[model samples]
Target: CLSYETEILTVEYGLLPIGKIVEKRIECTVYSVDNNGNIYTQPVAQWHDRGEQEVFEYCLEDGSLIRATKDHKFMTVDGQMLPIDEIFERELDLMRVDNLP
Candidate 1:
């Protein structure tokens, strides 16, 4: 993963108990928080367990944030889930970046 610029923003195989597992995958949209603590993600997929088709995980550090559905946020260090708004606000405050990464 590299830092963002003016450039326009641009998985699974598993056997199931059922016969001939029909694997499903969803294309995750790119998300970025600018230095202003603005969250930029569209069609945000909720946690799979929440009944969303795709579930994505995120990691925030040093004003840098990256998310991918491949991570499948089953669990995390916090062991809980928070609203997207809250997450963004907390991340922005913690990262100390005027714009989100």
Candidate 2:
């Protein structure tokens, strides 16, 4: 799971921290990818405060920052689920979202 400071892209607010989103009880749709790698919008089901855990920050080549727990899994371009900490350590192509509304 992502940390409270992690910025999430939403339909209502372009980019808002997860903490603020939960605090304000904001209802919005976020970008999601299906098994087929098709990008779509999905309503947030729920938010849980997984309080006080170790967080890791990943700096992407494009200068994007992703902060999450070590166990948080991200989809690779080749359709494999790789954890956050292992992403940069290995040579893998991370999936990217394109053609947003």
Candidate 3:
């Protein structure tokens, strides 16, 4: 069950909620990172609803909140993927992009 509350940048619209994108059945390009650590744009593939389920919320030091399921993997600073449930405070540094085009 993949879901994201964060506003995604689309080629047509600047940024929009994932729910809105799914509801409207809009096709657009979004930012994606390659294995070589290069940021690129790719067209959205598909959308599916898994119904309501448990999700975890994480609050960052910058007062930003992230909501995702336990199995959702996040990119670490060292290019590793860590699940939300396994993440520990100060144990790993998450990767983030401060600037966007």
**Per-residue accuracy of model 1 over 38-60 as CA lDDT, tens digit each:** 56765325322222334333555
As a whole number from 0 to 100, the lDDT of residue 5 in candidate 1 is 17
Q: The CA-based lDDT of model 2 is what? A: 0.83
Which candidate wins on lDDT?
2
Screening candidate 2 with a backbone cut-off below 3 angstroms (N, C-alpha, C), the clashing residue pairs are none
Worst 10 residues of 3 by lDDT: 84-93
Question: What TM-score fits each model?
Answer: 0.20, 0.86, 0.85
Q: On a 0 to 1 TM-score scale, where does candidate 1 land against the true structure?
A: 0.20
lDDT of 2 by residue, 30-84 (tens): 9988788777899988977767888888888889888888888898988778986
**Residue-wise lDDT of candidate 3 within 1-101, one digit each (tens)?**
34546678887787887877787777988988778788888899997666788877777777877777877788887787888666654467778877656
Candidate 1 error regions (>4 Å): 1-59, 62-76, 92-101
**Relative to the unseen true structure, what is the C-alpha lDDT of residue 30 in candidate 2, on a scale of 0 to 100?**
96
Best of the two (1, 2) by TM-score:
2
Q: Give the Cα error of residue 26 in candidate 1, in Å.
A: 9.3
For model 1, the local distance difference test gives: 0.34
